[PDB]
Every structure is written in C-alpha cells, then in structure tokens.
C-alpha cells in the first residue's frame, strides 16, 4: 500500500455549470473506491464520468472521477475515497 494523493479541481465553467474533477494518484494496489458525494450521499454511476485505473510508470496507479454541477453548489459536493481500509473525503476548493 501507498496512500493516494487526492486533488480536486474545477474546470469548464459554462452555462451556469462547472465540472469538478477528483484525481487519485500514485497509489497501490489498483483497487480503489472513488465517487462524488452530494450532501454526503454518493452519486450514481450514470451522473459521473470515470477515468481508468492506469499505471503511473513509477510503480503505482492513478485514476479520476468527474461530475457536472451547478456553479454555486460546490460546497455540497465532496470527493470520497476508500483505499485498502482507509477512507477520506475532500471538498471542492474555494
């Protein structure tokens, strides 16, 4: 186990909407849970976009998950992560 580094970014603001992306990088092994939460409740699969769990080239893995939200409601959305028994929650940066 290598603990994942988590970074949350905002991008592609348009039409009152914005994309929030949660990136988990340089973790091992490949098995990881990554999902957006809304008021603490996990979003379904169909409302999120999923990156593959891919090797770094440094012997670890990385992935990402993104979802499209209304600009202004960022505080209600958090990125949730479970990796080999440990869990964490990260907010959208403000």
């Amino acid at each position, epitope marked *: 186990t290598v603990p994942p580094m988590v970074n949350v970014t905002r991008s592609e603001a348009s039409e009152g909407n914005i994309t929030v992306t949660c990136r988990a990088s340089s973790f091992y092994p490949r098995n990881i849970i990554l999902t957006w939460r*809304q*008021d*603490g*409740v*996990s*979003l*379904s699969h169909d*409302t999120q976009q999923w990156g593959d769990v891919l090797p770094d080239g440094n012997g670890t893995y990385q992935t990402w998950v993104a979802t499209r939200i209304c600009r202004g409601e960022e*505080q*209600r959305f958090t990125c949730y992560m479970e990796h080999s*028994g440990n*869990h964490s*929650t990260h907010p959208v940066p403000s």
Partner: antibody, heavy 119, light 108 residues
C-alpha cells in the same frame, strides 16, 4: 417552520398498488433531497427510497426495488411514492423525511401515514 | 451491506443519571456519515446527532456523540423522564441503514 405532511395510506390487497404523497412547506423544496422511511408495527426504522433535489440520483432499498417508484414535483412542493405488487411485509407507517444540506441526515420528518396490506 | 448493531437492548436509569448507548458497524463508516435519532412512543423520529458528534438544531447540550471507524457512542447526561424513547443510530457510508435501536426507560 419546516413541515412535511404525508397522506394516502390505507388498506390494500396483496398484489395491489397504492400511491403515497408528502406535501412540504416552509422551505425551498427544490433545493433539498427527500426520502421515504418506514416502520413496521412495533418494529424498527427501515430506509425505503431516496431522490435528489433534481431527481438525478435515485436509490431504493433492495426489499422494494422493482416494486416502488419515488418521484417529486418541485412546482407543487410534493414528494410521491408509488407502491406496486404490495406484500404483507410492506405493512408499516411510511414517513416522509428531508435530507440535510451539506452534512446530511434525515433532518425533518413527516407525521407518518399507515399502509396496511391484507386480504 | 453495512449492518449496524446497538447495545444495550434496553437501558433503565433514574433521572439525573448518565446514559451510554453503543453503536457498532459491520465495516468502517466515516464519522461524517453516522447519525443518531430519538423516537418517542407516538411520534416520528427526530435527528439528534449528525456527523457522529454534531448536535442538530434545538438539541440540548446533554446529548453528545462520539466515535469513528466501527464504534460509536451516544451519551445522554442528566436523564429526564421525557427522555424515554428509542434511540437509533444510522449510517450512510453505503446506502442508508439503521441500527435496531435501544429503548431507554426511566426508573422510579
């Protein structure tokens, strides 16, 4: 003051169907996720179904998936539960419950409505 | 599925004493996703504690919560006769489930 008022329960035949409703007031309804929670007679609480404030995320307990449908009409401050193929184990008081902003929890509950499934 | 168990099943205590209620999760639940509810006999439940330790609106200070991982605690210091109720813990780490509840009776 936040108020949620359920209605529509009653006696129904096994295999029958029944529609529950919940009328909300005192807050901007279209901005809160909503839930149904039930309590069988003398029994514990059992979460039933969840719907997000724009109906994009919906969940059901395994014991009702395929038989119950949750929905909402934000313009009428209303939450619905359509119940089909009812069974005896569906007999309960059904509570309407609001989901708390940011930090979650069932932060307000309706008064409950009783559904009895029997022939 | 995450299953919540609660101990003790029933708790009989005199007014002014301290009630200690336990909740156990079949797997790790983050503290943000653990809540506690109070339900008096003829009533709907009401939210007591959210995020394991935060008091909900209008909840007096004698109600307190703590815990993390798989073990959580609700403390009611200085019991009152009206505190007679069933207390349920609830998680939404994964889906939404309730513990079976602990009945708290008043001794007299």
């Amino acid at each position: 003051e936040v108020q949620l008022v359920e209605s529509g329960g009653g006696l129904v035949q096994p295999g029958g169907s029944l529609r529950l409703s919940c009328a909300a007031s005192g807050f901007t309804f279209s901005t809160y996720s909503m839930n149904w929670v039930r309590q069988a007679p003398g029994k514990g609480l059992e979460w039933v179904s969840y719907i997000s404030y724009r109906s994009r995320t919906i969940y059901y307990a395994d014991s009702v998936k395929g038989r119950f449908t949750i929905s909402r009409d934000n313009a009428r401050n209303s939450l619905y539960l359509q119940m089909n193929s009812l069974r005896d184990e569906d007999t309960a008081v059904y509570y309407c419950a609001r989901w708390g902003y940011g930090s979650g929890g069932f932060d307000y509950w309706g008064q409950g409505t009783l559904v009895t499934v029997s022939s | 599925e995450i299953v919540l168990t609660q101990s003790p099943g029933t708790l009989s205590l005199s007014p002014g004493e301290r009630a200690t209620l336990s909740c156990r999760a079949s797997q790790s639940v983050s503290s943000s996703y653990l809540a506690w509810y109070q339900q008096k006999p003829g009533q709907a439940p009401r939210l007591l504690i959210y995020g394991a330790s935060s008091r909900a609106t209008g909840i007096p200070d004698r109600f307190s919560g703590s815990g993390s991982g798989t073990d959580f605690t609700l403390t009611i210091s200085r019991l009152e006769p009206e505190d007679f109720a069933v207390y349920y813990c609830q998680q939404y780490g994964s889906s939404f489930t309730f513990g079976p509840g602990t009945k708290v009776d008043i001794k007299r």
